[PDB]
Amino acid sequence: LSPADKTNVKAAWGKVGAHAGEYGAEALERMFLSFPTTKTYFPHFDLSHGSAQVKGHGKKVADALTNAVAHVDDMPNALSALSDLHAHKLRVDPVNFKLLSHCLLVTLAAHLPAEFTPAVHASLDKFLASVSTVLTSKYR
Amino acid sequence: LSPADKTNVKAAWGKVGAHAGEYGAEALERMFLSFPTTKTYFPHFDLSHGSAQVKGHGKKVADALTNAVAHVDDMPNALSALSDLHAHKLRVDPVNFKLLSHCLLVTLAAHLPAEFTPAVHASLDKFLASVSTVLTSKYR
Amino acid sequence: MHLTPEEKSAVTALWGKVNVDEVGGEALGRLLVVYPWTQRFFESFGDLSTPDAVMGNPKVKAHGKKWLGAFSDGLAHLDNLKGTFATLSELHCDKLHVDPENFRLLGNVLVCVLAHHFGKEFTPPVQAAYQKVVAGVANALAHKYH
Amino acid sequence: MHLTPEEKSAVTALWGKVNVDEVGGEALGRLLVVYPWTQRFFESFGDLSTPDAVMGNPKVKAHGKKWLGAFSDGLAHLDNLKGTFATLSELHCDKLHVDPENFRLLGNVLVCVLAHHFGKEFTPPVQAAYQKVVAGVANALAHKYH
Ligand code: HEM
Ligand code: HEM
Ligand code: HEM
Ligand code: HEM
């Protein structure tokens, strides 16, 4: 992530403000509907629209991303605990992280008409890819 | 790559010995036949079996890998020039590196009956993944 | 491709609101900016060094109307995408040498553009329907690669 | 799936030399070792901490014969893989919750095993034919996911 990418990310994520958790749930819903195979990881969840479990999980995901933004110059350490968790317990196949990243970009695009410029779009894609790389770094 | 991965890689690649170039051409042939879409990057090559262009390219690929093994504790710098080349000129889509890696593992499996143990298989897969990551690190 | 009546109507309805020219250029431009390596097929388009340069390039806009126009006529034949794009598939493979993976990347960028353009109207169910369509088109375009 | 007569005979011929029990356990074991996260579906198999532990585990071997046996009967129906695996597809989705990506990983490991087992006889053309088969089987198994 170039310094410019770091600036666009913080600007865009700032605008998200308190809507983060809500955007996190929307992205999950978008993922479950567009890519049905991702549902295999949540057989224990009520995956109906407006589900409390989805909203709750949505906020956890959103909170982690917010933590990543605040520590973009040191994500591996900032997400160390989550990296261990997905690698040793959850064990979600790596391919799935690109599906959620895509749904998160779609969600941001739908809510940030003015901030989602081609440049910002590019920086956010790199940012989520970096996050996904960190979360799967301890798999093998 | 754990130190153990580094040991398995060097042991396996040592056995390859002078056959490296020849194995590199076989892997390319295996790739072009199994995954036809990869041919879109070599419209300027005679891709018929035993082609001089394929054998020649096979050795270059093999030589680079040998360089990566000899400098596994510093691949980014060791492959800096190739990283720039694929990122700025060749511009091969990242997905394609997993296809070649797979064909290289198949090639090694077919030639190293005794050395291709489950453990070695695992270390070689991680090694090629690391190589692919280095070669695409400068794309964006 | 098989789409439920619901998904069918959802796609058709939203597309009636699409400015083919603008959306096509927008999507192609974002492709070139977000995934720079796709620029390998457009060296003859000129200056593509910056986002501004890419989005304001006349050749990008012209081509924009071109591919999306073909994409558009495709929505009128959802029952037979393979048959509808057979010729274009042969063209992108034998003459243009375009890696099929690119069709998928463009399909996703198109989805981002639609969401950016329509906002809340691009609901999760609407997105799901379009993800099926673009995947269907990408597969139809890669069908004759050999 | 559509295979040329050449690819058909190549697959059939090599498979007559396969020890279903051994190959099945070998492939499943290498899957668990090379892609550790796939172990999430086999917590009830016991000790899978080391390669040796994985390759010498009785439950892995038993299951090995099981899936490859089904895979084997599938080769007798290359003209209709979807129809042949419909029930198993529903099972892996609704009851087992297996991410379809896993079928592709297992398909590639299977190819590595065959090459390791047959050496030079596993020629590039033979591999290409088998890559088509495993991809066809993986798609047939993911067909009823919803
Ligand atoms: C940007 C990527 C992602 C981030 C930042 C992320 C973050 C998190 C966080 C913070 C938790 C909460 C853990 C806890 O309860 O302590 C979690 C749980 C989990 N994640 Fe990830 N995750 C990501 C991607 C994925 C993907 C791609 C999937 C699979 C499709 C996934 C599946 C899960 C599951 C199933 C859980 C546990 C759910 C439960 O509590 O029952 N995650 N993730
Ligand atoms: C382990 C991964 C790979 C390695 C180590 C590698 C290495 C190399 C090397 C050393 C060259 C020679 C450059 C020169 O002539 O100075 C090269 C060229 C090239 N590579 Fe990569 N490469 C890899 C993967 C790929 C893949 C996946 C493709 C595409 C399917 C690809 C396509 C090309 C092309 C088309 C050229 C130029 C061929 C020519 O000279 O006409 N490479 N690569
Ligand atoms: C669903 C998506 C796509 C559709 C429907 C499509 C459609 C078309 C059409 C209608 C043409 C004009 C053919 C002619 O010159 O007679 C064309 C040309 C071309 N397409 Fe595609 N295309 C798609 C995606 C792509 C992608 C992703 C790339 C690569 C990044 C690409 C690269 C090209 C190039 C380089 C040409 C030649 C342009 C020229 O000669 O002026 N296309 N495409
Ligand atoms: C082409 C590949 C595959 C085939 C043909 C296949 C076939 C089968 C068959 C025949 C069964 C037995 C069903 C029954 O209990 O009645 C089964 C069970 C199962 N499969 Fe698959 N399978 C495949 C791949 C996978 C993969 C990659 C995984 C996940 C890593 C997986 C995980 C399971 C599990 C956990 C069971 C249940 C075992 C038990 O209850 O003892 N399968 N599979």
mmCIF file of N, CA and C in Angstrom, chain A residues 27-106:
data_model
loop_
_atom_site.group_PDB
_atom_site.id
_atom_site.type_symbol
_atom_site.label_atom_id
_atom_site.label_comp_id
_atom_site.label_asym_id
_atom_site.label_seq_id
_atom_site.Cartn_x
_atom_site.Cartn_y
_atom_site.Cartn_z
ATOM 1 N N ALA A 27 -22.869 -6.311 3.387
ATOM 2 C CA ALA A 27 -21.878 -7.043 2.604
ATOM 3 C C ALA A 27 -22.042 -8.554 2.789
ATOM 4 N N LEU A 28 -22.265 -8.998 4.026
ATOM 5 C CA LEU A 28 -22.450 -10.431 4.287
ATOM 6 C C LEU A 28 -23.691 -10.932 3.566
ATOM 7 N N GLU A 29 -24.780 -10.177 3.669
ATOM 8 C CA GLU A 29 -26.015 -10.555 2.992
ATOM 9 C C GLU A 29 -25.768 -10.640 1.493
ATOM 10 N N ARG A 30 -25.085 -9.632 0.940
ATOM 11 C CA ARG A 30 -24.769 -9.634 -0.485
ATOM 12 C C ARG A 30 -23.957 -10.874 -0.849
ATOM 13 N N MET A 31 -23.006 -11.239 0.010
ATOM 14 C CA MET A 31 -22.177 -12.419 -0.235
ATOM 15 C C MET A 31 -23.002 -13.712 -0.231
ATOM 16 N N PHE A 32 -23.795 -13.929 0.821
ATOM 17 C CA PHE A 32 -24.599 -15.152 0.923
ATOM 18 C C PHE A 32 -25.551 -15.346 -0.254
ATOM 19 N N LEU A 33 -26.109 -14.250 -0.769
ATOM 20 C CA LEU A 33 -27.026 -14.330 -1.908
ATOM 21 C C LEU A 33 -26.325 -14.503 -3.255
ATOM 22 N N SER A 34 -25.238 -13.766 -3.468
ATOM 23 C CA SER A 34 -24.518 -13.842 -4.734
ATOM 24 C C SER A 34 -23.641 -15.082 -4.859
ATOM 25 N N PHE A 35 -23.018 -15.498 -3.758
ATOM 26 C CA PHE A 35 -22.134 -16.664 -3.770
ATOM 27 C C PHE A 35 -22.630 -17.652 -2.700
ATOM 28 N N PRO A 36 -23.647 -18.455 -3.041
ATOM 29 C CA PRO A 36 -24.242 -19.430 -2.121
ATOM 30 C C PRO A 36 -23.267 -20.373 -1.424
ATOM 31 N N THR A 37 -22.167 -20.725 -2.080
ATOM 32 C CA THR A 37 -21.230 -21.656 -1.458
ATOM 33 C C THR A 37 -20.642 -21.136 -0.153
ATOM 34 N N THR A 38 -20.594 -19.813 0.001
ATOM 35 C CA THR A 38 -20.057 -19.224 1.224
ATOM 36 C C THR A 38 -20.929 -19.542 2.440
ATOM 37 N N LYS A 39 -22.150 -20.011 2.203
ATOM 38 C CA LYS A 39 -23.039 -20.336 3.316
ATOM 39 C C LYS A 39 -22.625 -21.588 4.077
ATOM 40 N N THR A 40 -21.775 -22.407 3.461
ATOM 41 C CA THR A 40 -21.321 -23.650 4.079
ATOM 42 C C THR A 40 -20.563 -23.412 5.375
ATOM 43 N N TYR A 41 -20.103 -22.180 5.575
ATOM 44 C CA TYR A 41 -19.356 -21.822 6.768
ATOM 45 C C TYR A 41 -20.226 -21.310 7.906
ATOM 46 N N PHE A 42 -21.512 -21.097 7.635
ATOM 47 C CA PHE A 42 -22.415 -20.598 8.660
ATOM 48 C C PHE A 42 -23.680 -21.444 8.808
ATOM 49 N N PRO A 43 -23.538 -22.775 8.870
ATOM 50 C CA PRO A 43 -24.694 -23.662 9.019
ATOM 51 C C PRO A 43 -25.387 -23.464 10.371
ATOM 52 N N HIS A 44 -24.679 -22.835 11.308
ATOM 53 C CA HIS A 44 -25.200 -22.589 12.650
ATOM 54 C C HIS A 44 -25.911 -21.243 12.796
ATOM 55 N N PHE A 45 -25.891 -20.442 11.732
ATOM 56 C CA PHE A 45 -26.523 -19.122 11.730
ATOM 57 C C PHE A 45 -27.904 -19.107 11.084
ATOM 58 N N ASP A 46 -28.752 -18.196 11.553
ATOM 59 C CA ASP A 46 -30.054 -17.993 10.943
ATOM 60 C C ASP A 46 -29.632 -16.981 9.874
ATOM 61 N N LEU A 47 -29.621 -17.383 8.610
ATOM 62 C CA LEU A 47 -29.190 -16.473 7.548
ATOM 63 C C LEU A 47 -30.311 -15.757 6.810
ATOM 64 N N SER A 48 -31.414 -15.495 7.498
ATOM 65 C CA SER A 48 -32.534 -14.797 6.881
ATOM 66 C C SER A 48 -32.259 -13.301 6.972
ATOM 67 N N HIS A 49 -32.837 -12.524 6.065
ATOM 68 C CA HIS A 49 -32.635 -11.079 6.081
ATOM 69 C C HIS A 49 -32.940 -10.499 7.458
ATOM 70 N N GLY A 50 -32.152 -9.509 7.866
ATOM 71 C CA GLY A 50 -32.369 -8.869 9.150
ATOM 72 C C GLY A 50 -32.062 -9.727 10.360
ATOM 73 N N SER A 51 -31.398 -10.857 10.147
ATOM 74 C CA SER A 51 -31.035 -11.754 11.244
ATOM 75 C C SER A 51 -30.128 -11.050 12.242
ATOM 76 N N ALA A 52 -30.355 -11.289 13.532
ATOM 77 C CA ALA A 52 -29.528 -10.685 14.568
ATOM 78 C C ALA A 52 -28.106 -11.231 14.483
ATOM 79 N N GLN A 53 -27.979 -12.522 14.189
ATOM 80 C CA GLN A 53 -26.666 -13.160 14.084
ATOM 81 C C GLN A 53 -25.824 -12.552 12.965
ATOM 82 N N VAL A 54 -26.464 -12.233 11.845
ATOM 83 C CA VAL A 54 -25.753 -11.621 10.716
ATOM 84 C C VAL A 54 -25.358 -10.186 11.056
ATOM 85 N N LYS A 55 -26.263 -9.441 11.686
ATOM 86 C CA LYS A 55 -25.935 -8.070 12.051
ATOM 87 C C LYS A 55 -24.799 -8.065 13.047
ATOM 88 N N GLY A 56 -24.869 -8.965 14.030
ATOM 89 C CA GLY A 56 -23.826 -9.030 15.033
ATOM 90 C C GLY A 56 -22.488 -9.396 14.424
ATOM 91 N N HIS A 57 -22.487 -10.384 13.543
ATOM 92 C CA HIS A 57 -21.239 -10.796 12.925
ATOM 93 C C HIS A 57 -20.750 -9.662 12.028
ATOM 94 N N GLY A 58 -21.698 -8.966 11.413
ATOM 95 C CA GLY A 58 -21.349 -7.863 10.539
ATOM 96 C C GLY A 58 -20.555 -6.807 11.280
ATOM 97 N N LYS A 59 -20.924 -6.525 12.526
ATOM 98 C CA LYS A 59 -20.208 -5.517 13.291
ATOM 99 C C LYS A 59 -18.815 -5.976 13.691
ATOM 100 N N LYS A 60 -18.665 -7.259 14.006
ATOM 101 C CA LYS A 60 -17.348 -7.765 14.372
ATOM 102 C C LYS A 60 -16.406 -7.602 13.179
ATOM 103 N N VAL A 61 -16.875 -7.999 12.000
ATOM 104 C CA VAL A 61 -16.082 -7.885 10.785
ATOM 105 C C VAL A 61 -15.698 -6.429 10.549
ATOM 106 N N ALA A 62 -16.689 -5.551 10.668
ATOM 107 C CA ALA A 62 -16.492 -4.127 10.478
ATOM 108 C C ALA A 62 -15.514 -3.563 11.502
ATOM 109 N N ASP A 63 -15.635 -3.988 12.755
ATOM 110 C CA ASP A 63 -14.728 -3.492 13.782
ATOM 111 C C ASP A 63 -13.281 -3.886 13.489
ATOM 112 N N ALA A 64 -13.079 -5.108 13.005
ATOM 113 C CA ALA A 64 -11.738 -5.585 12.674
ATOM 114 C C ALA A 64 -11.140 -4.729 11.559
ATOM 115 N N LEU A 65 -11.931 -4.462 10.522
ATOM 116 C CA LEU A 65 -11.466 -3.637 9.403
ATOM 117 C C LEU A 65 -11.076 -2.252 9.906
ATOM 118 N N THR A 66 -11.880 -1.698 10.806
ATOM 119 C CA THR A 66 -11.587 -0.383 11.360
ATOM 120 C C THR A 66 -10.257 -0.434 12.093
ATOM 121 N N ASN A 67 -9.989 -1.558 12.750
ATOM 122 C CA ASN A 67 -8.729 -1.721 13.463
ATOM 123 C C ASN A 67 -7.588 -1.789 12.464
ATOM 124 N N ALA A 68 -7.832 -2.447 11.333
ATOM 125 C CA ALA A 68 -6.823 -2.572 10.283
ATOM 126 C C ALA A 68 -6.467 -1.205 9.698
ATOM 127 N N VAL A 69 -7.470 -0.359 9.514
ATOM 128 C CA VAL A 69 -7.237 0.974 8.957
ATOM 129 C C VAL A 69 -6.397 1.831 9.906
ATOM 130 N N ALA A 70 -6.716 1.767 11.194
ATOM 131 C CA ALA A 70 -6.005 2.538 12.209
ATOM 132 C C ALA A 70 -4.568 2.061 12.420
ATOM 133 N N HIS A 71 -4.252 0.884 11.891
ATOM 134 C CA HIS A 71 -2.919 0.303 12.033
ATOM 135 C C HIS A 71 -2.443 -0.249 10.693
ATOM 136 N N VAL A 72 -2.775 0.440 9.606
ATOM 137 C CA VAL A 72 -2.395 -0.025 8.277
ATOM 138 C C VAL A 72 -0.885 -0.226 8.108
ATOM 139 N N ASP A 73 -0.078 0.506 8.872
ATOM 140 C CA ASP A 73 1.374 0.367 8.785
ATOM 141 C C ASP A 73 1.893 -0.753 9.683
ATOM 142 N N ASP A 74 1.008 -1.667 10.072
ATOM 143 C CA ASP A 74 1.389 -2.780 10.938
ATOM 144 C C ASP A 74 0.211 -3.741 11.136
ATOM 145 N N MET A 75 -0.403 -4.150 10.030
ATOM 146 C CA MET A 75 -1.550 -5.048 10.075
ATOM 147 C C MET A 75 -1.286 -6.456 10.599
ATOM 148 N N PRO A 76 -0.172 -7.081 10.192
ATOM 149 C CA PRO A 76 0.089 -8.435 10.680
ATOM 150 C C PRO A 76 -0.008 -8.543 12.197
ATOM 151 N N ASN A 77 0.551 -7.570 12.906
ATOM 152 C CA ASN A 77 0.492 -7.594 14.361
ATOM 153 C C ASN A 77 -0.903 -7.231 14.873
ATOM 154 N N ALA A 78 -1.540 -6.269 14.214
ATOM 155 C CA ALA A 78 -2.873 -5.811 14.609
ATOM 156 C C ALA A 78 -3.955 -6.876 14.436
ATOM 157 N N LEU A 79 -3.751 -7.779 13.485
ATOM 158 C CA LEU A 79 -4.710 -8.836 13.203
ATOM 159 C C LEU A 79 -4.172 -10.213 13.577
ATOM 160 N N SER A 80 -3.082 -10.235 14.339
ATOM 161 C CA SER A 80 -2.452 -11.482 14.739
ATOM 162 C C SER A 80 -3.448 -12.494 15.288
ATOM 163 N N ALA A 81 -4.270 -12.057 16.234
ATOM 164 C CA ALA A 81 -5.256 -12.927 16.852
ATOM 165 C C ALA A 81 -6.281 -13.489 15.866
ATOM 166 N N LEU A 82 -6.753 -12.660 14.934
ATOM 167 C CA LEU A 82 -7.724 -13.125 13.948
ATOM 168 C C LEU A 82 -7.071 -14.061 12.947
ATOM 169 N N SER A 83 -5.809 -13.791 12.635
ATOM 170 C CA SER A 83 -5.070 -14.637 11.712
ATOM 171 C C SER A 83 -5.012 -16.054 12.304
ATOM 172 N N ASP A 84 -4.634 -16.157 13.575
ATOM 173 C CA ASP A 84 -4.556 -17.467 14.236
ATOM 174 C C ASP A 84 -5.911 -18.159 14.204
ATOM 175 N N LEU A 85 -6.955 -17.399 14.533
ATOM 176 C CA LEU A 85 -8.318 -17.914 14.558
ATOM 177 C C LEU A 85 -8.804 -18.497 13.236
ATOM 178 N N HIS A 86 -8.626 -17.774 12.133
ATOM 179 C CA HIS A 86 -9.115 -18.304 10.862
ATOM 180 C C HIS A 86 -8.239 -19.460 10.397
ATOM 181 N N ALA A 87 -6.946 -19.379 10.684
ATOM 182 C CA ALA A 87 -6.022 -20.422 10.265
ATOM 183 C C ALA A 87 -6.159 -21.730 11.038
ATOM 184 N N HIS A 88 -6.334 -21.641 12.351
ATOM 185 C CA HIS A 88 -6.387 -22.853 13.168
ATOM 186 C C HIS A 88 -7.748 -23.406 13.597
ATOM 187 N N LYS A 89 -8.789 -22.576 13.604
ATOM 188 C CA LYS A 89 -10.130 -23.038 13.990
ATOM 189 C C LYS A 89 -11.165 -22.959 12.866
ATOM 190 N N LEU A 90 -11.435 -21.741 12.405
ATOM 191 C CA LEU A 90 -12.415 -21.517 11.345
ATOM 192 C C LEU A 90 -12.046 -22.239 10.052
ATOM 193 N N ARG A 91 -10.793 -22.100 9.644
ATOM 194 C CA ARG A 91 -10.286 -22.765 8.451
ATOM 195 C C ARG A 91 -11.100 -22.545 7.166
ATOM 196 N N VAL A 92 -11.454 -21.287 6.925
ATOM 197 C CA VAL A 92 -12.193 -20.885 5.731
ATOM 198 C C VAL A 92 -11.261 -20.910 4.517
ATOM 199 N N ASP A 93 -11.679 -21.549 3.427
ATOM 200 C CA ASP A 93 -10.802 -21.597 2.257
ATOM 201 C C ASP A 93 -10.481 -20.180 1.785
ATOM 202 N N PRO A 94 -9.203 -19.921 1.455
ATOM 203 C CA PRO A 94 -8.721 -18.616 0.994
ATOM 204 C C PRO A 94 -9.527 -17.978 -0.129
ATOM 205 N N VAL A 95 -10.028 -18.790 -1.056
ATOM 206 C CA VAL A 95 -10.804 -18.257 -2.175
ATOM 207 C C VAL A 95 -11.966 -17.379 -1.709
ATOM 208 N N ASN A 96 -12.562 -17.737 -0.575
ATOM 209 C CA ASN A 96 -13.712 -16.998 -0.063
ATOM 210 C C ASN A 96 -13.452 -15.547 0.346
ATOM 211 N N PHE A 97 -12.214 -15.221 0.704
ATOM 212 C CA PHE A 97 -11.931 -13.848 1.093
ATOM 213 C C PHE A 97 -12.087 -12.866 -0.071
ATOM 214 N N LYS A 98 -11.870 -13.322 -1.305
ATOM 215 C CA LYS A 98 -12.033 -12.431 -2.453
ATOM 216 C C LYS A 98 -13.510 -12.148 -2.709
ATOM 217 N N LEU A 99 -14.360 -13.113 -2.374
ATOM 218 C CA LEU A 99 -15.797 -12.965 -2.572
ATOM 219 C C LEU A 99 -16.379 -11.916 -1.633
ATOM 220 N N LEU A 100 -15.928 -11.926 -0.381
ATOM 221 C CA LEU A 100 -16.408 -10.963 0.609
ATOM 222 C C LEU A 100 -15.859 -9.573 0.295
ATOM 223 N N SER A 101 -14.584 -9.510 -0.087
ATOM 224 C CA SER A 101 -13.954 -8.233 -0.440
ATOM 225 C C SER A 101 -14.767 -7.582 -1.556
ATOM 226 N N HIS A 102 -15.117 -8.368 -2.573
ATOM 227 C CA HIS A 102 -15.936 -7.869 -3.680
ATOM 228 C C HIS A 102 -17.273 -7.326 -3.162
ATOM 229 N N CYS A 103 -17.940 -8.084 -2.289
ATOM 230 C CA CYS A 103 -19.222 -7.637 -1.757
ATOM 231 C C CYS A 103 -19.092 -6.407 -0.866
ATOM 232 N N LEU A 104 -17.939 -6.248 -0.219
ATOM 233 C CA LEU A 104 -17.698 -5.071 0.605
ATOM 234 C C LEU A 104 -17.519 -3.850 -0.314
ATOM 235 N N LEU A 105 -16.844 -4.033 -1.448
ATOM 236 C CA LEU A 105 -16.658 -2.924 -2.384
ATOM 237 C C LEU A 105 -18.005 -2.535 -2.976
ATOM 238 N N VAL A 106 -18.826 -3.531 -3.306
ATOM 239 C CA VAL A 106 -20.147 -3.232 -3.850
ATOM 240 C C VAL A 106 -20.928 -2.425 -2.811
#
